[PDB]
Amino acid sequence: MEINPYLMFLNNDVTSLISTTYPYTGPPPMSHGSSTKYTLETIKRTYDYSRTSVEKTSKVFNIPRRKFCNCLEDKDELVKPTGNVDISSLLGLAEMMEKRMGEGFFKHCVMEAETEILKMHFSRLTEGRQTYDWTSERNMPAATALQLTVDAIKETEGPFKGTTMLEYCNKMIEMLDWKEIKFKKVKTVVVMGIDSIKHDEFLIRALTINTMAKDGERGKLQRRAIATPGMIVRPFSKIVETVAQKICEKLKESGLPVGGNEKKAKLKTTVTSLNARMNSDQFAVNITGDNSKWNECQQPEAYLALLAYITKDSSDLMKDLCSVAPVLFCNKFVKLGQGIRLSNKRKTKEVIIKAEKMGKYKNLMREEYKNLFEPLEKYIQKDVCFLPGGMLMGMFNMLSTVLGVSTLCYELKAKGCFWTGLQSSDDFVLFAVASNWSNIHWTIRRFNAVCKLIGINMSLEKSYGSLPELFEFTSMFFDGEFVSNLAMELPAFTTAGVNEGVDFTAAMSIIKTNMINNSLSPSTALMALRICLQEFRATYRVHPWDSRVKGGRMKIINEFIKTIENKDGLLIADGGKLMNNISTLHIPEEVLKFEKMDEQYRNRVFNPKNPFAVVSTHSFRTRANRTLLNTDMRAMMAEEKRYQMVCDMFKSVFESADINPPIGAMSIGEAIEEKLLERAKMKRDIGAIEDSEYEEIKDIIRDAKKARLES
Amino acid sequence: MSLLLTIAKEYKRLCQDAKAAQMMTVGTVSNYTTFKKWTTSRKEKNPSLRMRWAMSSKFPIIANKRMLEEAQIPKEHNNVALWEDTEKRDHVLASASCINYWNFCGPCVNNSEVIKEVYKSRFGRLERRKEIMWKELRFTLVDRQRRRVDTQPVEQRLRTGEIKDLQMWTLFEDEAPLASKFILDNYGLVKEMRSKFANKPLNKEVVAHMLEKQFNPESRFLPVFGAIRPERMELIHALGGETWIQEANTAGISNVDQRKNDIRAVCRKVCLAANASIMNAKSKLVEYIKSTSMRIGETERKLEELILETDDVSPEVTLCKSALGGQLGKTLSFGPMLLKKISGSGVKVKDTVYIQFEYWSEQEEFYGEYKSATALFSRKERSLEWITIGGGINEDRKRLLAMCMIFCRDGDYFKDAPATITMADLSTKLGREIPYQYVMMNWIQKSEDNLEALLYSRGIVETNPGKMGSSMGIDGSKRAIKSLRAVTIQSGKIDMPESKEKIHLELSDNLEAFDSSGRIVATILDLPSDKKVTFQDVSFQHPDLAVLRD
Amino acid sequence: RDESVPLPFQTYEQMKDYCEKFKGNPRELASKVSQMQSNIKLPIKHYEQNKFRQIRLPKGPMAPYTHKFLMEEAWMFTKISDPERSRAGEILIDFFKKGNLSAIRPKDKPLQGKYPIHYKNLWNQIKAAIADRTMVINENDHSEFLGGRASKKIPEISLTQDVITTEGLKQSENKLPEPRSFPRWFNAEWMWAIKDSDLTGWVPMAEYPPADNELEDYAEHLNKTMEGVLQGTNCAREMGKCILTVGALMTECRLFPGKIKVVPIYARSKERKSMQEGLPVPSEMDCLFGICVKSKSHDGMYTIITFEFSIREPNLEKHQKYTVFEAGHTTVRMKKREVPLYLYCRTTALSKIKNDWLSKARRCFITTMDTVETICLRESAKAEENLVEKTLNEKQMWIGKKNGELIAQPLREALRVQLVQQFYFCIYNDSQLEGFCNEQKKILMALEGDKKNKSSFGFNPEGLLEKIEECLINNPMCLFMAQRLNELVIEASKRGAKFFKT
């Protein structure tokens, strides 16, 4: 007989069982080969989508810049994605957005932005995803990359005393005029040194963006790579991002700066709002809208203009600080990647090629490669390709969504002329109302017209629509019911990995939070517990006292057991059975077991004088792998360790340093010296320490002051 | 003794290194906050995998050498290695099992009392669970999707900056700024906390981190089912969800929940004091505020620091805050009702009509909050355009309907003239003419037939099939035999909006706050409660309440 | 900045002026209508494209057995475990070898084999190792066995001359995977995983927590029952062996990197006897499926060499990757006969990521659970009664087709189906599958759109079906689900017609 699982979809409603279509139980895809293919293919897609043959040579690069807004070389395939943005109509959406909600909408949003940023310490710039360090010309975690950037500025021209995002930005713009820059570059000789660079090279290195072959993306055969911009570009990006974030929050139709459990009701509210809005004649219908090549279509050139429109009134001191962020993307350089390999029909010999030397090999590559490559030789540079119009993905999600809401925000007076809904970045939900069924076609049509007018391209293949009851948004499917699915939060359930007490309790509170928001049923969560427990016992190599299992950790438990009376009340880490449940999820295991614990046990386990929601009896540091230390990365890290011992030292002096961010108009050393003197005097005057010893400390202090002064 | 010495010698060593020396001298101390941030502990790419990998080896974990040396044997009982002399950090490596051994056989006594009150937060969240009863049944529940409601509530909850001050003072004295505002005014809690925690030097960082949580109600945006008390919040998951229900819960609550309501009544009277004299409303109310002293269950605290920094924003509380510099926007109060604005805009315009009047002509869509009843309304050009009710109890639905009609202000508003000119018109408060919306409001609050009058003032029609469930009766039923026009009930509740916003502006001379350059948020006098009952409450300075004998 | 500007204006200032002094007239109505005429945007209807050309499927060789282990045909070797002997888990086989295992040896001449002699030698190297220690003492055989290869590299700098003087036949090419056709064996595999095995339970599940009347009684009951059903199944068996063995390797990568090790393919089970008699005990034991060999190479993907016992005759069509031998004869029996033993051999690639996610196979239970549980609540919540127990036994789920007739089973046994389905989702996960589901959802939504007569529409169904086609390459599961969605579309079209049947 023929077993078909899909047959159950016959009688039942799909939305309830949609969690079984997604295969989240298994592992995700992974990158193989060269990421250069996708990159090149995508750049060609950018320029192609940019339907404009207008090309002007740049005054500074001697490279043809294709600036393309308003100017439109239409193609017959109009339905196919476009990237040409009619700035006039854009600002039209901007005005008719503002006049829709207040009259000082932008002025105020900007105000909030200005405030938050002007406050900001540049150290907070280290918070974020990985970004491109241009010193070593590699990708790094933002913190270390910024460390090198600044350290380099210091070794070039003297230490940085800005302490603010503004002065940081001012130094950034100052460096472009610098004819010479110095680096911490590691060169091994059969060691770290000081390399030079020129303005011409540096500029490119600054505008440079790096390619990441995608990992962690769910649901695609082919890899949609992600870009990770340079350190000098990032601040200005954060500025715009925050402006847009402020704008976003205020919009009801925005789905971006608001997420998770909130998004859900945003929808329920606007749903019943529209259902009430209806006339007896008027007919409502929905569409699930997904967009393809969302980023490729949008253009930083258009964003520059829009940003100029918003900053029109706010200030001439921050307007100039808004316009800077786009121009670095209007003039952006894209790193090509790993490269291409050569092989004979021998499987014997292989020849690796850099991105630089592609132009050497020319016709040697297959015809497909050639066809993609030849046009890009115009815009090419030694290691990098230059492209204005394309927007790199992920950087301006905020401002993107802003634009999207600007489309849905409202037009021509027609019978049943209604559309509105939600939008997060690319994804958009569209509700359309029109008097009669035929008109609905025309109204929806007008919407995609206006979207595609400014570069918003609905995916003609992926999107779909129906009566108002059925629609999907970011893995959230609707009906009368409201998307019961746990598919989203599956790998988070497993052991977090910091330490045993913290691991389990966190796991619990997760199960809870999931139970409330995601709306999973209880027996599910009970199983979820028993699972997380089993995998916890495994990940930390522990088992119950009644368990026959013998091991190293268990062997001790064989003498342990007999002593303790209340063997149930034991912690899991020491081999205790499960005491927590669905009802006691909020409660950490330590507490729930505590009362029932044996006195000897409790006192001996939690004692503060030890070799040891967050519970404190076991907390330990995981040793870093012996991988980063062997490479030249350690030769670079020789600076970072010099930061460490200092930080450790000051914390040894000031206890609350980590807790309360140290303040006051003093140098670190000065405060250290005077505080040491105070503690020395304290211990001497009344406490148990000798006088000549106190004088010895005073001597060490002053002797240290000498060496400090000399520097 | 050498503990202080070796630190000094280390400083000598570090400042001798010119590289470190200059970075130690240049700039403020604030640089530490940046310097620390230049160190991630390790790579975080594959968490669960990394840990499973980590514990796999027998001796990986970093551990403390000295204490273990002092208290206990480093060697094993089953002759499996536990300790070495091999290393960069001062911390020497050791196996996982040892930790379990000291837990078993380590010599230690009398730590029990020290523990719990350090985590009175967590431990209490346990204690509460003991005292409750249970029951079980099932239903297609309609929960209330979005309430920004305090969870994990604790007595004497406060803002983040101030709690940071506490954090500093209690943990240590040696390095603490002499912060005035919090310490002078809220001293006593300072005493208690500082006393229990300063004496026995244990877990200096940890305790701080958990006290931060101990007075922080996690006001998340969550789905509830009618039980809106901040105590049932902590453990909602076990209580319900869309198909689950539990029972016997209201009882055990912390002393906070009722204490907040007491403060609401406090603000009521304090506002009646300023109401009494209309020579000035600005310079007097402020006095009644700063003078008054509250007594919490275990602490004396000023009224100012309670008002400014209270979570719950009631119509009274709005007024009370308005005097001070406390920004608490997103709140709209009208009589007993609470409202939120979600759509469009329009200007205040003047229109005289036979019974001067202020009317708004906005195509504005707003949300209606009333006891046991929620709804959605939209007005355009001084008349209700769209309406839908998601209430529970019929009466409260009717109340919603009414109140919102008042705020709406149709032409029928003028048509109903039983009395008013006689009493409602002029308010007997130094000959002050009370605003007109609130006039008809009070007229409806007067009697039972006054509700019936304007309820009938709306268009009434026999509703069509397909509107049987949606239609609203005059009595508040779902029968649909006869029903009101431009209104439909919803089988279930209605979601509440939320905005992370702060707005503040001075108040007018008649307890009116034209905040955000208009908007009439202040609602004058919400409720005319002429009562004077107080418990453990302090007052001062010619309070106009006679409690002072000669 | 002054040359970053989009407009005909070049100086930033002029762009600034046009922005600041902007007031847009209503010409965007006409701009939108002209945009519309140029657009020719597709106003699509569902009744018109209701066919969806059924579903396109690839033509070629029948797809092979992508799973790292064989399930249905795989054979077991029982051993009653000691708590202290078994605890090693690496000694399990050493204690096995004292049994009959040592006897088995294959002939040089193999059925359907791709590299006989290599595998035969290695088998001997395993057997020999086991006697001394579970490691393969090879420096050179290791390198080849990994290869079955390296490619020596050439500097570009010196290469310029060999371009000028072309030698070694210099060129550049990349390759693609060959498409396969819908599998037949898959159905039988599913039907086998669905039915209960004689051994009781495989996946190590922890104890249950203390219970209060209200909620815990329910949760605890539901779990005990569901676990009870799903632990008996063969699907669970395979979950078990996966978890235990991939766990064993995951340890071996830390224990001996750059070394060759012999790891067993085992699963643990206790037998349950409810004859109502006081037996000695329910039988506590662990059984073996075959032997496995680790080879560390390339950080990156490990190379692994699987050897499984089987009692069934190999099928060339599905076991193409597999290399079969004639091993010998093994005894099988029952009472209210020894059948020849075949040894299946292959090589495969394991990413550390795959090692991790496949190790934690228990996760599949959970995604079933929720899916199951929800049905019972949603149902019972209507009647406001405890209908869980009733719903599980009474509610009928459409499971299959037999004799051209649509079949359905109760939710408790059709539970097995979902579980298997989730387990396969775990095993058979390829970027292909990912794309498949993540586009398939659109199909499902259009379907229910037609069910409740919501008069749907899809803008470019040819394009959708093209992406669906595109992600269908050589993935047994992926294709299986494709074909099963065909049959769905069919039977659904038969119930209510907003679809096509060829």
Side-chain angles (χ1 to χ4, degrees), chain A residues 1-4 6-15 20-22 25-27 30 37 56 58-59 65 67 70 78-79 87-88 91-92 95 218-219 221-222 287 301 304-305 312 319 323 331 341-344 346-348 350 360-361 366 411 419 437 444-446 448 460 462 464-467 469-470 472 481 484 491 494 521-524 526-527 530-531 533-535 537 550 577-578 580-581 583, chain C residues 1 3-7 10 12 15 18-20 22 24 29 32-33 35-36 38-39 41 45 84 87 149 152 154 156 159-160 168-169 171-172 174 187 191 204-210 216 219-220 222-223 227 351 357 360 362-363 367 369-371 373 378 397-402 418 421-422 425 429 431 434 437-438 440-442 445 448-449 451 454 456-457 459-460 463 470 481 484 487-488:
Chain A
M1 77 99 65
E2 292 283 6
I3 291 171
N4 187 323
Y6 283 91
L7 295 182
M8 70 196 295
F9 283 93
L10 292 173
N11 48 316
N12 304 288
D13 298 312
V14 179
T15 59
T20 54
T21 82
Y22 291 143
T25 57
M30 198 244 291
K37 304 173 213 175
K56 171 197 156 279
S58 167
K59 293 179 179 179
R65 189 186 300 104
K67 300 205 283 178
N70 302 20
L78 201 283
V79 293
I87 60 97
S88 304
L91 301 194
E95 161 181 342
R218 282 287 192 177
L221 172 66
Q222 296 161 304
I287 68 100
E301 294 184 8
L304 181 58
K312 65 177 179 178
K319 169 154 188 173
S323 68
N331 293 6
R341 281 194 273 194
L342 289 182
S343 59
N344 42 20
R346 311 201 162 165
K347 273 304 179 74
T348 285
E350 273 197 333
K360 171 188 168 190
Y361 285 26
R366 197 162 40 188
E411 190 58 22
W419 70 80
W437 184 254
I444 296 177
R445 277 148 100 170
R446 289 205 98 182
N448 200 8
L460 298 166
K462 298 168 195 175
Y464 63 98
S466 60
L467 188 130
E469 288 186 31
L470 283 175
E472 172 225 281
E481 283 49 48
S484 79
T494 51
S521 49
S523 197
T524 302
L526 177 71
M527 181 150 285
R530 213 177 307 105
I531 288 302
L533 171 70
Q534 199 74 82
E535 294 184 350
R537 287 227 180 88
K550 184 139 310 205
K577 61 170 77 75
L578 174 59
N580 295 82
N581 211 297
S583 63
Chain C
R1 186 148 144 283
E3 62 184 87
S4 293
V5 298
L7 276 171
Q10 276 267 333
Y12 183 93
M15 192 259 279
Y18 182 46
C19 292
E20 295 197 342
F22 171 78
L29 74 93
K32 218 195 273 183
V33 172
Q35 168 62 20
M36 268 301 304
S38 291
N39 202 316
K41 176 185 171 187
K45 291 297 298 172
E84 298 182 1
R87 74 177 163 75
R149 56 184 165 186
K152 199 186 288 177
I154 294 94
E156 177 275 319
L159 193 267
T160 85
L169 280 100
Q171 276 179 27
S172 174
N174 193 33
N187 188 72
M191 267 198 297
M205 282 297 206
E207 72 276 41
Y208 281 64
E216 271 97 69
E220 175 172 314
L222 195 152
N223 263 238
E227 261 189 49
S351 181
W357 255 253
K360 288 184 267 246
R362 313 150 170 291
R363 301 194 191 184
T367 43
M369 175 70 82
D370 170 56
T371 310
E373 198 173 345
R378 294 191 186 281
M397 290 310 175
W398 277 255
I399 184 173
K401 179 193 284 184
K402 198 181 81 176
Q418 271 304 312
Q421 193 206 59
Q422 292 292 331
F425 280 139
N429 210 354
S431 55
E434 285 274 349
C437 306
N438 276 44
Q440 166 214 329
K441 56 182 186 180
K442 289 129 183 67
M445 293 300 286
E448 210 203 325
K451 283 189 169 293
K454 293 179 184 166
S456 299
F457 50 89
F459 295 87
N460 198 257
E470 174 181 345
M481 302 304 267
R484 296 296 185 182
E487 296 196 341
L488 171 65

Side-chain angles (χ1 to χ4, degrees), chain B residues 355-417:
Chain B
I355 311 170
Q356 200 194 61
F357 303 87
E358 289 190 356
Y359 81 109
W360 288 264
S361 47
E362 339 180 334
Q363 181 227 323
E364 167 213 1
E365 204 175 43
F366 55 91
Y367 163 76
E369 165 78 42
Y370 194 77
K371 292 184 178 181
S372 297
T374 71
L376 215 169
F377 303 83
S378 70
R379 185 195 76 266
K380 176 246 287 183
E381 297 291 343
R382 96 207 290 280
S383 55
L384 44 91
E385 188 164 25
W386 301 294
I387 293 190
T388 294
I389 315 302
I393 313 166
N394 303 343
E395 175 183 345
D396 300 8
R397 297 171 189 174
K398 298 189 294 181
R399 296 296 181 88
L400 257 176
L401 292 170
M403 296 277 311
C404 302
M405 283 174 47
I406 280 76
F407 185 74
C408 181
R409 182 210 287 279
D410 278 31
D412 302 339
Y413 180 99
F414 306 103
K415 299 305 169 293
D416 309 285

Side-chain angles (χ1 to χ4, degrees), chain C residues 380-477:
Chain C
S380 60
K382 284 192 176 79
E384 314 152 30
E385 210 185 338
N386 184 340
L387 297 181
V388 162
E389 273 288 40
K390 193 172 293 258
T391 301
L392 281 178
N393 321 325
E394 304 228 306
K395 175 154 255 292
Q396 225 70 38
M397 290 310 175
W398 277 255
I399 184 173
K401 179 193 284 184
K402 198 181 81 176
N403 304 0
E405 298 297 335
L406 293 161
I407 312 302
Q409 274 196 331
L411 192 58
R412 65 170 51 257
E413 300 182 3
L415 208 157
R416 298 164 178 182
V417 161
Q418 271 304 312
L419 194 266
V420 163
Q421 193 206 59
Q422 292 292 331
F423 183 46
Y424 288 165
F425 280 139
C426 193
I427 293 308
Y428 291 73
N429 210 354
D430 282 336
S431 55
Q432 298 161 51
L433 178 63
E434 285 274 349
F436 173 74
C437 306
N438 276 44
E439 301 304 325
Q440 166 214 329
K441 56 182 186 180
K442 289 129 183 67
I443 304 160
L444 271 291
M445 293 300 286
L447 166 137
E448 210 203 325
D450 288 3
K451 283 189 169 293
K452 303 182 80 176
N453 196 22
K454 293 179 184 166
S455 65
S456 299
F457 50 89
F459 295 87
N460 198 257
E462 271 76 59
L464 179 66
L465 271 297
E466 272 171 34
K467 302 284 260 70
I468 294 155
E469 181 72 357
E470 174 181 345
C471 67
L472 264 61
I473 308 191
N474 68 112
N475 183 346
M477 180 73 175

Side-chain angles (χ1 to χ4, degrees), chain C residues 169-181:
Chain C
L169 280 100
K170 320 236 81 294
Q171 276 179 27
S172 174
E173 188 192 0
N174 193 33
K175 292 202 167 184
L176 296 176
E178 294 169 14
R180 263 73 189 192
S181 70

Side-chain angles (χ1 to χ4, degrees), chain A residues 47 55 70 80 101 126 141 179 203 211 219 248 282 290 300 354 362 414 416 436-437 452 541 559 587 604:
Chain A
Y47 276 96
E55 196 168 42
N70 302 20
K80 187 176 180 180
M101 293 174 59
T126 67
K179 297 179 180 180
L203 169 65
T211 169
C248 271
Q282 295 178 7
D290 183 10
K354 269 187 156 68
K362 289 274 86 181
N436 305 315
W437 184 254
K452 280 183 175 282
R541 296 279 165 77
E559 73 180 333
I587 297 84
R604 288 166 173 179

Side-chain angles (χ1 to χ4, degrees), chain B residues 2-165:
Chain B
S2 75
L3 299 126
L4 237 73
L5 267 155
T6 52
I7 292 168
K9 295 195 291 175
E10 183 73 50
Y11 184 92
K12 181 198 183 76
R13 267 189 296 169
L14 281 183
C15 70
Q16 281 179 332
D17 183 357
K19 289 182 179 179
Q22 183 172 77
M23 59 165 278
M24 278 213 307
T25 304
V26 177
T28 170
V29 197
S30 304
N31 297 348
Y32 177 88
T33 317
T34 78
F35 293 151
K36 202 83 181 187
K37 249 163 186 175
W38 278 335
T39 325
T40 42
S41 71
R42 72 153 299 140
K43 286 231 175 190
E44 306 124 310
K45 59 184 187 176
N46 303 127
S48 193
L49 181 65
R50 169 179 63 260
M51 203 49 220
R52 294 176 62 184
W53 184 262
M55 290 305 295
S56 65
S57 306
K58 276 189 164 66
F59 295 87
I61 322 193
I62 295 123
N64 311 62
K65 192 183 188 182
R66 61 172 177 264
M67 187 74 260
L68 182 50
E69 291 171 354
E70 183 173 358
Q72 186 52 224
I73 305 176
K75 291 189 183 69
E76 216 194 62
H77 201 89
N78 275 329
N79 285 319
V80 177
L82 303 187
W83 273 97
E84 302 177 337
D85 289 35
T86 60
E87 227 156 56
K88 278 98 168 185
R89 243 185 159 181
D90 302 320
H91 314 96
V92 179
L93 303 174
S95 41
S97 45
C98 317
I99 295 169
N100 316 17
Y101 181 76
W102 196 72
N103 287 342
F104 171 46
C105 197
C108 285
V109 190
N110 203 8
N111 198 31
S112 62
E113 181 69 19
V114 183
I115 301 173
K116 46 188 67 215
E117 70 183 337
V118 178
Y119 303 151
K120 187 70 201 328
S121 59
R122 297 286 177 266
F123 271 92
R125 297 174 215 294
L126 174 270
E127 282 176 28
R128 291 172 244 192
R129 187 191 158 280
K130 286 210 178 73
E131 302 187 52
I132 25 167
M133 340 273 273
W134 303 103
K135 179 195 116 188
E136 71 281 5
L137 289 179
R138 257 169 291 257
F139 207 103
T140 310
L141 169 69
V142 186
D143 42 25
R144 207 90 44 85
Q145 181 82 58
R146 255 174 69 186
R147 310 302 302 280
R148 191 178 287 177
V149 175
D150 299 24
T151 74
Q152 299 190 38
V154 179
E155 189 66 311
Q156 311 133 338
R157 18 63 227 174
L158 58 160
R159 298 181 69 88
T160 54
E162 47 185 357
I163 192 167
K164 192 66 176 295
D165 282 9

Side-chain angles (χ1 to χ4, degrees), chain C residues 133-173:
Chain C
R133 208 179 66 168
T134 45
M135 290 92 168
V136 172
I137 318 94
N138 267 335
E139 282 312 315
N140 203 357
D141 195 26
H142 169 50
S143 65
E144 153 69 26
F145 204 32
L146 168 58
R149 56 184 165 186
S151 307
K152 199 186 288 177
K153 296 174 283 179
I154 294 94
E156 177 275 319
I157 311 100
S158 51
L159 193 267
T160 85
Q161 191 61 50
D162 193 13
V163 161
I164 298 168
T165 317
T166 78
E167 307 171 13
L169 280 100
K170 320 236 81 294
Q171 276 179 27
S172 174
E173 188 192 0

